[PDB]
Structures are given as structure tokens and as C-alpha cells.
Scaffold this motif. Structure first.
Motif, PDB file in Angstrom:
ATOM      1  N   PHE A  23       0.826  -1.203   0.000  1.00 40.08           N
ATOM      2  CA  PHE A  23       0.000   0.000   0.000  1.00 40.08           C
ATOM      3  C   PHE A  23       0.861   1.254   0.000  1.00 40.08           C
ATOM      4  O   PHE A  23       0.435   2.298  -0.509  1.00 40.08           O
ATOM      5  N   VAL A  28       0.452   7.607  -3.851  1.00 39.39           N
ATOM      6  CA  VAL A  28      -0.992   7.409  -3.927  1.00 39.39           C
ATOM      7  C   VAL A  28      -1.555   8.257  -5.060  1.00 39.39           C
ATOM      8  O   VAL A  28      -1.276   9.459  -5.153  1.00 39.39           O
ATOM      9  N   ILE A  32      -7.092   6.198  -7.110  1.00 44.02           N
ATOM     10  CA  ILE A  32      -7.257   5.230  -6.033  1.00 44.02           C
ATOM     11  C   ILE A  32      -7.859   5.887  -4.799  1.00 44.02           C
ATOM     12  O   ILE A  32      -8.647   5.270  -4.074  1.00 44.02           O
ATOM     13  N   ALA A  33      -7.490   7.139  -4.539  1.00 45.59           N
ATOM     14  CA  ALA A  33      -7.876   7.853  -3.323  1.00 45.59           C
ATOM     15  C   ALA A  33      -8.388   9.222  -3.741  1.00 45.59           C
ATOM     16  O   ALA A  33      -7.617  10.187  -3.836  1.00 45.59           O
ATOM     17  N   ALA A  75      -1.219   9.110   5.803  1.00 44.89           N
ATOM     18  CA  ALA A  75      -2.248   8.079   5.822  1.00 44.89           C
ATOM     19  C   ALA A  75      -3.212   8.277   6.977  1.00 44.89           C
ATOM     20  O   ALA A  75      -4.405   7.990   6.840  1.00 44.89           O
ATOM     21  N   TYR A  78      -5.494  11.448   5.733  1.00 42.90           N
ATOM     22  CA  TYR A  78      -6.431  11.254   4.633  1.00 42.90           C
ATOM     23  C   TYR A  78      -7.503  10.218   4.969  1.00 42.90           C
ATOM     24  O   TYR A  78      -8.685  10.419   4.653  1.00 42.90           O
ATOM     25  N   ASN A  79      -7.113   9.118   5.606  1.00 42.29           N
ATOM     26  CA  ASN A  79      -8.009   8.002   5.879  1.00 42.29           C
ATOM     27  C   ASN A  79      -8.623   8.111   7.268  1.00 42.29           C
ATOM     28  O   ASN A  79      -8.041   8.697   8.184  1.00 42.29           O
ATOM     29  N   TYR A  85      -5.664   1.208   5.889  1.00 44.38           N
ATOM     30  CA  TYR A  85      -4.503   2.066   5.671  1.00 44.38           C
ATOM     31  C   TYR A  85      -4.125   2.834   6.930  1.00 44.38           C
ATOM     32  O   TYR A  85      -2.937   2.972   7.247  1.00 44.38           O
TER      33      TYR A  85
END
Ligand SMILES: CN(C)C(=O)c1cccc(-c2cn(C)c(=O)c3[nH]ccc23)c1
Length: 101
Positions: A23, A28, A32-33, A75, A78-79, A85
Motif C-alpha cells: 500500500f 498514492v 485510487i484515493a 495516511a 487522509y483516511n 490504511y
């Protein structure tokens, strides 16, 4: 290669073993994101770190660790916390810093 390059290549190998899905292997993409590049101002990933080692851009272990932390912090920004992730970023951040010191 220089001693620092050799040590950082060793650390990078050990860190990447903690990410078997890869990952964190490559930058990124927004595909995908969604919106990633508009949320994360300073992206980082293991592949870019490798290129920086090869280009001899790290002059201290501290600088390499800062890029590693930046990758994990991105990570966790964002997540959401209940995502694979985020959990992996938090796990490898702590284990990686211990492994490196
Ligand atoms: C099945 N997938 C989507 C993947 O194997 C894959 C592929 C490439 C990148 C990522 C990804 C990485 N990182 C670090 C993220 O924070 C993130 N947020 C959403 C996706 C990702 C996931």
C-alpha cells in the motif's frame, strides 16, 4: 555506496516487509484515493524514499525517519481511523521507529 545509503537501504527493506500488500510502495494516485493530492500537501511513499536514497538526498538518519513519519502521518490524515490504511500506518510508524532505534 556510502555508509548512510547502505544503512537507509537496510532500514527501508525492513520497513517494506511490514507492508506486504505494498500500500505504501508507490505514490498514492487520486484515482485510487479521490482528492488525495488536494488534501495531502507533501506526499511520501517508500518508492520515493528509495529514489531519494539512490540519489543520495538523505544526509542523516533523522531526515529519513522524518520522511517515514510523513508517509504514515499522511495516511492518518487522509483516511479514517477504521480503515486498513490508517491501522497499518499507525502500526508501522511505531514499529518502524523502534526498529530504527
Ligand atoms: C486495493 N487497493 C485500493 C490498494 O491495494 C491500494 C493501492 C495503492 C494505494 C492504496 C492506498 C495507499 N494509501 C497509503 C492510502 O492512504 C490509501 N487510501 C486509499 C487507498 C490507499 C491502496
Amino acid at each position: 555506496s556510502t555508509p548512510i545509503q547502505q544503512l537507509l537501504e537496510h532500514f527501508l527493506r525492513q520497513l517494506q516487509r511490514k507492508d506486504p500488500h505494498g500500500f505504501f510502495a508507490f505514490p498514492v494516485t487520486d484515482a485510487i484515493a479521490p482528492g488525495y493530492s488536494m488534501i495531502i500537501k507533501h506526499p511520501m511513499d517508500f518508492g520515493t524514499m528509495k529514489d531519494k536514497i539512490v540519489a543520495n538526498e538523505y544526509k542523516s538518519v533523522t531526515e529519513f525517519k522524518a520522511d517515514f513519519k510523513l508517509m504514515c502521518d499522511n495516511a492518518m490524515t487522509y483516511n479514517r481511523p477504521d480503515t486498513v490504511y490508517y491501522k497499518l500506518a499507525k502500526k508501522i510508524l511505531h514499529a518502524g521507529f523502534k526498529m530504527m532505534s
